[model samples]
Target: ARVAVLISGTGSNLQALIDSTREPNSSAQIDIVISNKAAVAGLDKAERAGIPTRVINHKLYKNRVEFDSAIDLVLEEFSIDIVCLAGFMRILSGPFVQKWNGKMLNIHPSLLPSFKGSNAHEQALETGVTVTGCTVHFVAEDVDAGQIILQEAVPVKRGDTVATLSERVKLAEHKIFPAALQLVASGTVQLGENGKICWV
Candidate 1:
């Protein structure tokens, strides 16, 4: 099955996906990478990797609903079965989420269900926590709210600002997100009818 990745900024995670998919016999295949902003550096990364990339103008749309509908159309056109949100920043509607349902995945740069939304690295530093990583979860309607598939915790070192912390934390994220996606792709991690994520 083919997967599509959506990006809005630096595509470091998208690079992780491209590299992992080159593992000769990786379970998942990255078919396309789409961007909401035409000038995003992530789009360049995707193109450099030779993955087909496209930019859709979300601002041109009347609303998020219109934007999401266009997103669905592009995914369908690419025959994309799985969707991965690497850095996409839109606040999607319920109907949009329902359209993708169990097929959409999001990788948030924080230990989820705790530090949700943006600036997670800074949050970790401000709270005086030594450990902060990321979560790869099913994309739900709420921002960074979803059934977590997997998490990896990285130790926050001293003198770490948001940039430095994010740098280290993202390395953990690169590892975890791909591994989690592979588990799901290979049917090792199963999402039950009760909405529980279980490893079989």
Candidate 2:
């Protein structure tokens, strides 16, 4: 199967995917890497790894729909099988998300059903929750409210700052993101009845 990744920042998660896919006979066959911003470090990582890269500057579009439509054009052009959002900051429009539905996957930085938005780590810490983690889920129109695919719990230490907590959750993200992607790639995971993510 073929896949494409969307990135907007440092792309540490993108790096994880790149590293996992580099293995011989791995199911992680990434075909292209697309970034909304130009000259980001994520592009550099993809370039260094020899993956074909494209840039669709969001600033060029009039609105979210136009920007997402442009991204759709690229996906159509490549005949991409899966779309992975690696730190892509923009919220996708409903029409765009509906079109991709089960084909799109995203990894969010919180356990979800708990913290759901920007600064998730900071929110987690503020709530005094002892356990916070990462989630890899199907992309829904309501942001991180999709059916869960995988999750890994990270303990919130007593003296942890946002940066330290983020770093720990990021470590969990790297591990589970690839694992979740593998399930999608191998057809071991799918959307079952009533929008539940089924593990085969």
Candidate 3:
């Protein structure tokens, strides 16, 4: 499927997806990369990969909905099928979220329903959790409260610093984010009328 990846930062997850699709017969293909900020590292990543990029600079907009509507226009212009949020740091408007609903995907640095919002890794450390990981899931209006697609456990070891744990969890994120996108891309992931994910 043609996927549009929205990113804001370094885009390690985007790099992983680019690498994975280089292999034979990959299901997901990034149609474009969108960024909220201009002159960001994620744009550089997309440029290096020879992928098209769209910038909607959220700071210029007056409100969240305006910013989201601008992005929705870019997505429509590209004829996008799937929208993947790699590290885009804006809370989408309810209208925008509902427009994409089943077609939107996002990856969070924590096994969600826990440690949601910003600073997830720090939250994990503060809570003293023994095990934490990354979650790739569907994007709903409620932040990080969408259907879980994939997760991988990363054990918190002795005296593990936030940086250490973040790095470890990021490794898992790289693997599962693309896998979740692939499931959606291949038409094997189904969302029923009952709000449950059916893996075909």
Per-model TM-score, in order, reads 0.94, 0.96, 0.96
The sequence of per-residue lDDT tens digits that candidate 3 reaches over residues 74-163 is 888888889999888878899999999899999998989899898998888889999999998899888888888889989998799988
Off by over 4 Å in 1: none
Superposition error at 129 for model 3 (Å): 1.3
Clashing pairs in 2: none
Clashing pairs in 1: none
- Show where candidate 3 strays beyond 4 Å: none
Which has the better TM-score: candidate 2, or candidate 3?
2
Report the alpha-carbon TM-score of model 3 versus the true structure. 0.96
lDDT (CA) for every model shown? 0.84, 0.90, 0.87
Candidate 2 Cα outliers beyond 4 Å, as residue runs: none
**Which lDDT tens digits does candidate 2 get at residues 125-174?**
88999999999999988878989999999999999999899999999999
Better-scoring candidate (lDDT), 1 or 3? 3
The candidate scoring highest on lDDT is: 2
Arrange candidates by TM-score, descending. Answer: 2, 3, 1
